[PDB]
Amino acid sequence: DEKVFTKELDQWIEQLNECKQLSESQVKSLCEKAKEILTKESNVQEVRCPVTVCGDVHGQFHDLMELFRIGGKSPDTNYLFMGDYVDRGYYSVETVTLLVALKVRYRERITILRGNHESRQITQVYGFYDECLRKYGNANVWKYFTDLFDYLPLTALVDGQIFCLHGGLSPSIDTLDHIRALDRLQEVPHEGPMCDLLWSDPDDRGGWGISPRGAGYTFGQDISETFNHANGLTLVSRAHQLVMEGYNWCHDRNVVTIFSAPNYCYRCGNQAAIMELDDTLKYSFLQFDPAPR
Amino acid sequence: NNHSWLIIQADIYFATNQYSAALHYYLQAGAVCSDFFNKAVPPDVYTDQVIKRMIKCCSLLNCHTQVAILCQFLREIDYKTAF
Amino acid sequence: NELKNLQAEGLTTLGQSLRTAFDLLNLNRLVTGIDNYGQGRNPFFLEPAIIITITDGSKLTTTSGVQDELHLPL
Ligand SMILES: [Mn+2]
Ligand SMILES: [Mn+2]
Fold it and tell me: What letter does residue A57 receive in the DSSP assignment?
């Protein structure tokens, strides 16, 4: 049973890498195994060094393939994706299918987090629902992928020292034990700890503030310093805003923005970047251009 | 274990410019009347005069955060001596 | 930018701040000659202004002690 599913899933990886969509029953089985493998995973999953952390993909599949050509193939280099790989891109189902199949194939080598775009309402309004209707035909595969987004872990921890999440901090979160105590098994609300986890963003302020997004908050250097000191952390990695250079060290070498989708929405022209934590926590930046088409 | 006699001893030490012993016996009287400060000290032992004398004893021993905390204790908070 | 970069690390000195705000506004008022002294009071010469003090209601504090009643400096 393990051998036949392993070789079938490897053929699924090979068929995904050449940009071919799967079938509905194959997505059914992939999503069911993904549900089984993601049930036994905490809100703060400890990812051991080394790991190559990548940021937002947002359904740019050829850019994802280039990313695998830069940082290394998925069997050989560890990856940690901070969500938001589903909307604002032409090839959306292939990207999420490749990530989920790589997760269920390599359970210690691919870590997948949850973004704010990976919810029912946002996928319904910003494009994944339409892509679902135009390729697979009905809205049922969107139902499996929304449940799969529902089970995804929120944050991740690298060697007890680097905190990786999609959005930003929270006025209601003070310790990492509160992250592990949240009920993750629900769609992201309009108010609460987890909406702020997936929606907040840093800014050069002196305190909290209403984010110009309709949800989440915004935080400054004092808040980030307090969170890093009170939790034994030294770095907060996140991927929520478009960056030209692909990386930002804001809040005085404490908060790191890593955007990994070059030419966002195919009209912005940003040079994306990813971070490569070695076995000595001894990092480097891989900065790349969009793929030829 | 008689609080009034301890207050008298503390006042005699305070009059003879022995601030450490006066503070010791004031604290000792507070520990007699309340069960080692488990309940609140009654106002007939730590009067405003007694707390003010304790504040003066802390001030002349160059312990100023203790002066601020100890002058929160009064019925009206003495902000001038705190500052 | 100056709104989002405020740090609350001072005393509750309401009178001096209120006098400073009024001094700014009345300063430009008397610069422009909006108020014609001696020639009457013309309410058509008008510079509409609303000032909003957002505070907490704590005790009024100076460097010497707490002040019970609010007096503007003269
Ligand atoms: Mn995204
Ligand atoms: Mn996002």
Answer: -
